[PDB]
Each structure stands twice: as structure tokens, then as C-alpha cells.
Amino acid sequence: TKQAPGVSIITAEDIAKRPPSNDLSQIIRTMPGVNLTGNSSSGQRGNNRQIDIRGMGPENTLILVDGKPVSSRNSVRYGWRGERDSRGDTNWVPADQVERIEVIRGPAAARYGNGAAGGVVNIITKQAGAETHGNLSVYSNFPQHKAEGASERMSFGLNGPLTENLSYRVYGNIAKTDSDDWDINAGHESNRTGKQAGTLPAGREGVRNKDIDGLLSWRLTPEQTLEFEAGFSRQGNIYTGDTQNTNSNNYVKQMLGHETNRMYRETYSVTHRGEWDFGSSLAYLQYEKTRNSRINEGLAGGTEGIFDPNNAGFYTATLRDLTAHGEVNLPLHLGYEQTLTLGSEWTEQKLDDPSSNTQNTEEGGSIPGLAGKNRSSSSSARIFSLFAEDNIELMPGTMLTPGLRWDHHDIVGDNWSPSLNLSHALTERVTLKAGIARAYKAPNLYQLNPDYLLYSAGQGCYGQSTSCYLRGNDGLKAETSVNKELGIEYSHDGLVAGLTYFRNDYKNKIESGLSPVDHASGGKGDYANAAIYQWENVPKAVVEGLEGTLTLPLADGLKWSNNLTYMLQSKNKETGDVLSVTPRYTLNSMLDWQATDDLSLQATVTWYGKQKPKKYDYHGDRVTGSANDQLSPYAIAGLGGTYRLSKNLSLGAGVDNLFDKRLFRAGNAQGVVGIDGAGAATYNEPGRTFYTSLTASF
Numbered sequence: 001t002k003q004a005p006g007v008s009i010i011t012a013e014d015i016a017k018r019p020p021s022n023d024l025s026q027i028i029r030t031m032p033g034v035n036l037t038g039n040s041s042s043g044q045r046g047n048n049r050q051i052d053i054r055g056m057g058p059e060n061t062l063i064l065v066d067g068k069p070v071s072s073r074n075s076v077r078y079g080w081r082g083e084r085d086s087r088g089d090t091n092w093v094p095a096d097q098v099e100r101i102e103v104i105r106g107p108a109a110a111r112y113g114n115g116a117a118g119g120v121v122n123i124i125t126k127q128a129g130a131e132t133h134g135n136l137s138v139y140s141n142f143p144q145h146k147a148e149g150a151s152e153r154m155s156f157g158l159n160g161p162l163t164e165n166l167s168y169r170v171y172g173n174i175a176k177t178d179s180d181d182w183d184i185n186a187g188h189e190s191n192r193t194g195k196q197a198g199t200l201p202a203g204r205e206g207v208r209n210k211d212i213d214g215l216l217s218w219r220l221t222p223e224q225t226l227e228f229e230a231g232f233s234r235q236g237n238i239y240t241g242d243t244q245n246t247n248s249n250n251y252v253k254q255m256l257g258h259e260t261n262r263m264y265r266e267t268y269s270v271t272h273r274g275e276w277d278f279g280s281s282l283a284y285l286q287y288e289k290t291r292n293s294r295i296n297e298g299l300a301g302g303t304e305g306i307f308d309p310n311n312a313g314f315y316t317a318t319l320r321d322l323t324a325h326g327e328v329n330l331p332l333h334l335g336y337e338q339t340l341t342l343g344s345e346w347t348e349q350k351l352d353d354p355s356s357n358t359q360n361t362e363e364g365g366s367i368p369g370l371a372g373k374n375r376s377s378s379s380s381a382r383i384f385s386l387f388a389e390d391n392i393e394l395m396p397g398t399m400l401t402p403g404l405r406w407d408h409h410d411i412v413g414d415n416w417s418p419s420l421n422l423s424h425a426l427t428e429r430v431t432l433k434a435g436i437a438r439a440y441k442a443p444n445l446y447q448l449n450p451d452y453l454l455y456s457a458g459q460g461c462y463g464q465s466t467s468c469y470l471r472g473n474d475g476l477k478a479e480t481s482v483n484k485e486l487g488i489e490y491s492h493d494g495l496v497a498g499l500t501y502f503r504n505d506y507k508n509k510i511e512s513g514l515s516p517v518d519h520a521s522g523g524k525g526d527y528a529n530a531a532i533y534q535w536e537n538v539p540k541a542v543v544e545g546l547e548g549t550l551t552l553p554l555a556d557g558l559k560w561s562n563n564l565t566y567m568l569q570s571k572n573k574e575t576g577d578v579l580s581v582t583p584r585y586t587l588n589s590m591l592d593w594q595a596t597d598d599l600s601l602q603a604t605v606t607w608y609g610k611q612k613p614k615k616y617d618y619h620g621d622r623v624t625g626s627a628n629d630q631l632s633p634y635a636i637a638g639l640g641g642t643y644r645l646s647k648n649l650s651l652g653a654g655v656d657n658l659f660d661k662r663l664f665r666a667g668n669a670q671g672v673v674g675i676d677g678a679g680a681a682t683y684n685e686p687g688r689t690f691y692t693s694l695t696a697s698f
């Protein structure tokens, strides 16, 4: 099946029948347990939603490509409210060159370590065969409303041998998603008066992609395989007015329709793969270098995350990420039949950010231990990791899998992430799964850095209206989560029915602090001697919910599939406010008709449950008026087909959002001075959209 308890596979065939515009988040998000959310509840950068597993937020969703981490979003400033001006890390690999996507949720994911507390998404690429194969894929959509940005996508692939013991695979992608019109939210915006009269919450950012990958596989012996690959990708945006607080100035307007951020992502990887009688061996070296070039933004209050007109022009943040991994796999014949895996991991994150550490102390007064100008640009962390998995068969059908992961973070210290996963054949048709693990989150290099300094004159300060600083804190503990899950699945002759309960107990969630630790000295007028908050560890939080799947073969030619997410609870146990904003539930429903040998037809519906905003503003006080707005449940329906013209040529065509259900970003969730809040109404849902596709392959 494509759905076991805790796990989902998306195949190449699935990608082709529900083609994504551009980014894979579109299809990844239809798996059980998966939402498309921001990281916290501000609604800041709310059209920049990313993959969330079990409401643990997208910082706790680890993206791999062929088992190798993507860290590129770690190059974008992490803001006061736990959001980056980032589109996330699911748009580096082009849809049509993906063989399959693996989603691993909760206790089964903890064994991957740092940032898998929600889960792992592993995007797997198509590889060389015994012969040469290749493809040319093109997709083009056509929105009903011209405001909304159309998408165009062209990707090739080409793989095969060179010698009897040398293989290669290459691909390249060129794609563009046009931005929404600067004015798409006009007449839908929250009430904006005084200085902020005229301001707009923005529609979806556009992006231009250029992806090129080369791989050489070398199997110099029957038992021994050696892979070298390099990756070059480039995303440039099309700016449509997006700003942290939905405030505007003249620089912002100058940049409507222009590239204001570019990400270059370069990966080189060496991978050796061993298979001999004693068992299996795998080790890799990845060097990921990300250049995040964007227009300077301010770091104070309502100037946080708007283009700074006094310091016009681009800066470039640089992320050098180094990953090396070793594992072996030992069949053991013992008093119980089992398979043992032993592994080290080593990672280094260097971050050079020439912008984020430039907030100065002239207004709020100076901060003992923090230089007011020319602070370091530099951050780094090394994690060393050892782990073993023991995959024990107690009696045929049953598996017990205990694993220990230990990590040395060179700042935060030692972490112990133990795990245990049971699966039980009760019947040849019914399987019970239970799992309890403690997953791991190392603080990000922004949270961790005492040189990283934000300021507010009050409006953003917890439990007061006075000026305050927020400061990085190298004293922070790692976030840990005891991810529990209990689940049952019936499977027999493509009849699949399964339901999982999950509870993640969340300890030391890192977040802008609630109490001043200190007070600065000096500065100007009423703002002088500002309060100092740090990034704190929140003692306790909880997420809880249900994952369901049901697959019925109506007839031979015809398959009815459903995936269900239901979010029971999401609670910061300190403040009692929500962690994420998700829909209460999500049901994805596909009907797949194999109408002919050659013609396949697809109907889909997605139902989103109610969405409620945060109860408390940045002060910790209760929000009022349009800050309380909720989004009603709504559904999006679609038809598509694929008509195979030959072994060499297939055509696709369809319609997303048949009944043109549309939603509009009204702004951020809470009121500020002159900008009423928009509650849960923080993103744009696109309208009816026709799409066509063509795939030629040998």
C-alpha cells in the first residue's frame, strides 16, 4: 500500500495524475498527518506556508533528497515570531524527475535525529537503468482570474551506462510561477487607517527556478558502489508587496514585479554503497553551500522585515553545511531472528549573515556583553551522532525495533533520543502498530546567537508597552518531544482501512521570551533603559490528533482513495495559546477511473475544517474585533486525465478548484496601530485553474 500507520509513499504515477504547479508541497500536503502552515501563529509571511507534520511546525520537518539533508532555509533570518521570509525547501527538485517521496511521521522518524520531531520527507530521484532512458516533461496552467499567477515548467532527464561498471543520471529544470497581482487582496484587506491607510497584505510571491544535477555511479566491484553528484539550483522571486507586518514604504512599491531575493543552492556529494554476505554498508559526504541574496530589511518593531530605505541594496547570507554519515546492516541469527544497524553522523553549519546582527542600541540603551556596531556575522554548530537500530522478529509478522541515538551538540551539550516501534499481525489482514520515541531539535543559529538582536519600542514586548530587546541565547536547551502513536490497519486485495492516534509531548519549545532577564542602560527619551528578553525554552507543549486512510476498489477500472488528518489539540501549556494554525481536519478524496487501456481519469476533493487564530497578541493580552475572525470549513474539487498517445508520449489536462472557491489574505492575525488584524484569514486560496501537460520518454 501507499499508506501504512505513520508512513506514506507518493509514487511517480501519483505526481503525474495530480501534477503540482511548481513546488512539491502541493502534493506532499495530501498525505495523512501533513498540513501546510507557518511555524508559529503571527500569520507573518502567511502566503509562505511550508510542510508541517502533526502540527509540530515546518522547522521540525526534515527534507531529504536521496537521503541527504536540505538545510537552505537556515540561511533566511529567523524572526521574533518564528517565521522566515522563505518559501521552504520542497522546490529544489523538479516534480517530473522525482521517482517517489517518502513521508515518515512521529516515533518512526526520531531515529533521523535533528529536526525530525515532526517527521522526515525524503524526495527520491529517478536513477539510471541497465540501458539508457530519458524524458522531457512540460506543464502549463491558466488561472480563471488574471490576478493569480500562472505556472510554466520544463524538465528533462537522461540516464544510462558508459562502461559495464559506470552509470550516470542527469536532469535539468526551468520553471516560473508568476506572482499574484500587487492588488489581489484589495477590498479584502483588514481595516487600515492613519499612517497605514492604503497598505495591502500581499498575494503569493512568484519564483523562477533553474535546477541542474549530474550523477556518476561507479561499481568498481560486485560488492562495491561509489556515487559522485553535484547540484546547482537558483530561485529568484517576483516581489508582490509582502512585508512582515503588511506595512509599506516607497522602496517596497519600487520593487513590485522585480527580483528582491535570490537563493543559489550548490550540492556536491560522495556516496559509497557496500553489499556483501555479512550485510550492507552506506556512507556519504554532502557539501551544501547556500547564498541567500536579498534586499536589506530593518530589525526593529514595525520595521522588522520591510526593505530598509536608509541601507538600500542587496546583502548575501552564506550557509556552508557539511554532512557525513555512516551505517551498516547486520543480519543476526539468535534466540530471536533480528537485523542490527550501527551508525555515526557528523554535521557542520557555518552561517555568514552580514545584516541580521546590525540592530544597534542607540535608542533602547546599550546591553552589557553586546557591542552596538560591527558584531560578528558568523555562527556555527557541529553535532556528532552515534545510533543503533535493532529490527527484531519475535514471531513471523511481528517486529520490535528498539534504537538508541546519542548526539553531542558542541554548544547545547548531550542529547539522548531513545525509540521503540512495535508492529503486530493480529490477522493476515489486520496489523496493529504502537511507537514511542523522544525526538531531537537543536536550536537554530539565530536563536542561539547572543549577537542576534531585535528591538521594539513596546508594541511587540510581552507583558508591557516599554521598549524591549530580544536577544539570542547560547544557554538554550534542545527541544525534545516524546512522540507517542497507536494505530490499526486492515489491508487485503487493495482494500485498505487504517486509523492512527498520535500524541507528541513537546518539551523546551524555543520561542521569544515572556519575562525580561535584564534591562539595557541609556538611549533616548521614553525608550531609554529598554527591557532585555532572550529566546527561552517553553517547559511544556502538546500536539494530538488522528490520521486515517480508506481505499475501496469500487470495480476493476475504478479506485476510491481517502486520506484524513484531524488535529485534536495544539497547545503551548505555558500561555495556553495554539502553536501552529491548522485546519481542524483535512480529507483528501481521489476517484481514479482507468476508463481505457490508454485513458485514465481523476476526480479529487479536499475538505478543510475550521481554522481559529491565536487568542493572545505580542503583549500576551486578549485580541479583539477582526483579530478573532475564523475561516469556515470549505472544499476544493478537481478533475484531470492523462491520455497515453504511445509508449513514448502522454498528455495530461484538468481543472484545479472546479467551483472557484477563493480566499484572500486580509493581513496578519492580530491588531497593530493602524492595521486591524485578519485572524485566520492569512493566506490566498487560488481560484479555478486549467492545466495541461506533455511527457515524452524513451
Ligand SMILES: O=C(N[C@H]1COC(=O)[C@@H](NC(=O)c2cccc(O)c2O)COC(=O)[C@@H](NC(=O)c2cccc(O)c2O)COC1=O)c1cccc(O)c1O
Residues within 6 Å of the ligand: 195, 196, 245, 247, 300, 301, 302, 303, 455, 456, 457, 458, 459, 460, 461, 465, 618, 672, 673, 674, 675
Ligand atoms: O506591526 C508593528 N508596527 C506597525 C504599527 O505601528 C505603527 O503604526 C506605529 N507604532 C506605534 O505607535 C508603537 C507604539 C508603541 C510601541 C511600538 O513598538 C510601536 O510601534 C508607528 O510605527 C511605524 O509606523 C513603524 N514602526 C517603526 O518605525 C518602529 C521603529 C522602531 C521601533 C518600533 O517599535 C517601531 O514600531 C512601522 O510599524 C508598523 O507598521 C509592530 C510589530 C511588532 C513590534 C512592534 O513594536 C511594532 O510596532
Ligand SMILES: [Fe+3]
Residues within 6 Å of the ligand: 300, 301, 302, 456, 457, 458, 459, 460
Ligand atoms: Fe513598534
